Design a protein around this nucleic acid. Structure first.
Lengths: 180, 108
RNA sequence: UCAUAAUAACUUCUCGAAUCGCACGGCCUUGCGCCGGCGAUGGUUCAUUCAAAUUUCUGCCCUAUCAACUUUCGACGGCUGGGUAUUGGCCAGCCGUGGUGACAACGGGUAACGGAGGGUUAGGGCUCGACCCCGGAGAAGGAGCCUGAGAAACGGCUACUACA
RNA sequence: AAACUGCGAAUGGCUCAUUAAAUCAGUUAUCGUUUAUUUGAUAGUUACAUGGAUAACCGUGGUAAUUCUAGAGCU
RNA sequence: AUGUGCGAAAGGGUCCUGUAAGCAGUAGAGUAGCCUUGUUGUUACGAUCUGCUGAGGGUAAGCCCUCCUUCGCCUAGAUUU
RNA sequence: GUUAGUUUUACCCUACUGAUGAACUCGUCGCAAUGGUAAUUCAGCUUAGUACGAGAGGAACCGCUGAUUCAGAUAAUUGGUUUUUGCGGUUGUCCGACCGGGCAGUGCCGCGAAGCUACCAUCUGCUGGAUAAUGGCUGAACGCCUCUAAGUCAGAAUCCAU
């Protein structure tokens, strides 16, 4: 039964295979969004606390927060709900979702790290990934760099570099067209 | 070997005890003794029978409550470097002394 | 008791532009100051247009081996409300005993969607009209509903029955 | 390109099952109502510019199966 | 016939029934009075509901345990080989 | 041809099924003369689409697992029975009301332990000897032949024992 572990702080994700059930005994009967200790997973997990975020059933159905049951139930999912993407305005479709109580039946759990432990994870907490985009709105740029009322927000925007395919010319720069 | 629970009253069922009932609509009911099924076939509501497990949990007998809401709201952490500028670039620019900023306004 | 205006108050309560494109202009206290044109997209009320829903008068085939019909649980009328975009026995209470008929009611048949019109001719007539134009209804049989100015919609959704 | 947002998808096209004052025809009324759009008028009571999310995207997954969808990170 | 004795009570365990009497309540469809007219204004009536309450009652008469709960009884009377 | 019409007595003797018992001191542990006697039948898998036959058709021994009729016990589970008048619900009337009770031959209804009980529930039912029918061995009477005349082998749900 696989585990999907994510690190929001470092922006890193990993998937692991666990086949020994007594390590997963402490996970049973917990609810989605609860707090659990990662000590039974292994010696390298000492000092770790994890948050249960979601999972998938053996048939493939996902868990939906707010329904208390170990089996799966049929629901009339309207617009704005979690596991429904309507194809037409005002459309309502009846679907089946699995409850929020963890059990041995599910195939994959999804969970994230809340507090770092003393030991490090070989492929999860030892690497970080940069952000993708900087702020674009005018007021958000000023707050990010703690500028004053009149500090020429134009000059401080983040600009990257890109080069043509094979023209041999110098690369140029791109800017986000500050709004408001 | 395994144990089951009475559908009407929730009592534990051990092998060889009770009965098994199959209705016309293909629904399966299990009983532990004669008291349960005699009340079930009489069209009695299990939520109004004082000794059933389902009645007890509705009136919240022997159960306590827990709250952990505001504890989760505290979960905040640090920041990282955007692809455009490495982490050393952002804090150097935010910590520029005001004299440089004054020069920028006059120059512009 | 129309249009419109005035006074005392009220409201989980609105609207009265934090939006976009072209042109490059004119003043003097020369300040990264003030003013200025034409369009796009929105916005409250009245008027207009495309309409829609109800509504007045008269007009449909054969049959009496169909002569009395309507009010269990609205059938005809009065009153106070509820609901609807609005009128109304459309609905809820209370109170009257009425309404149609030999000038054919009520019921049964239709190998019956209605009309503009087709065929055949001294005149008078007989017969047909599913079908290119106008109006109405349906998307296998029944009911229910969301979005929206507008749907009880099916190349939209929910449930049962029958097929698959 | 993609994706959010706006509009249309209630027009066309097909058929004649039900239906005997019902549909329909000519002729009236709305001082008894709703109306997108079009057209013409029309509203004096931090400001040199306010606040939080989300899609596209990167990357990590489940089911034999569908225009099924999960949790993590930007704007 | 001095005993791990016998008998009568008691406590615990196990079962069956299904939440006792009593008191209290900003519970309760409503109704009738009095006033200073109230944000629960009070005085009276009210099937039922909620709390103390898986409570109360019964349990060997052919159920179990107790030397470590209490109180009683005892080396006979008669006949025969 | 058709319709309606009173069915008496056992306590006596014997027989049968069970139950006590005088005499030789009172007891405990044992042998077994004689009497009784018990089990029964089928189906499925495999052997096998094999032997046999031109074809059509179509067996059997062992082995394995179940079922029918009968017999002897038992009540852990499931079902029946209710005077446990054990607890609860309710109608009429009586004790002034509440509480707690009487009467209506057990007022009535739901559940109901204990005991009894059902192929309506569960368990169990043995193998030695001697033979009949028949098929054989050695072998005369009858210099050949022959299961019989002397002797002898196998053998049935039979008979006698365990």
């Amino acid at each position: 039964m696989k585990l999907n572990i994510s690190h929001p702080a470092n922006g890193s994700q990993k998937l692991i295979e666990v086949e020994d059930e007594r390590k997963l005994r402490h996970f049973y009967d917990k609810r989605m969004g609860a707090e659990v200790a990662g000590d039974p997973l292994g010696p390298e997990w000492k000092g770790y606390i994890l948050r249960i975020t979601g999972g998938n059933d053996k048939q493939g159905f996902p868990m939906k927060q707010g329904v208390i049951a170990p089996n799966r139930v049929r629901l009339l999912l309207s617009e704005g709900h979690s596991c429904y993407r309507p194809r037409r305005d005002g459309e309502r479709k009846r679907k089946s979702v699995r409850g929020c109580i963890v059990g041995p039946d599910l195939s994959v759990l999804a969970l994230s790290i809340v507090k770092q432990g003393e030991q490090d994870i070989p492929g999860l907490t030892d690497v970080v990934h940069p952000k993708r985009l900087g702020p674009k709105r005018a007021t958000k740029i000023r707050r990010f760099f703690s500028l004053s009322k009149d500090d020429d927000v134009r000059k401080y925007v983040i600009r990257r570099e890109v080069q043509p395919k094979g023209e041999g010319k110098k690369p140029y720069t791109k800017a986000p067209r500050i709004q408001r | 070997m395994r144990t089951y629970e009475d559908t009407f009253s929730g009592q534990r069922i051990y092998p060889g005890k009770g009965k098994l009932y199959v209705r016309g609509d293909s629904k399966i009911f299990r009983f532990q003794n004669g008291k349960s099924e005699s009340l079930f076939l009489q069209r009695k509501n299990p939520r109004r029978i004082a000794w059933t497990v389902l009645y007890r949990r509705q009136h919240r007998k022997g159960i306590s409550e827990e709250v952990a809401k505001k504890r989760t709201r505290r979960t905040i952490k640090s920041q990282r470097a955007i692809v455009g500028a490495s982490l050393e670039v952002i804090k150097e620019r935010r910590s520029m002394r005001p004299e440089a900023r004054n020069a920028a306004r006059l120059a512009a």
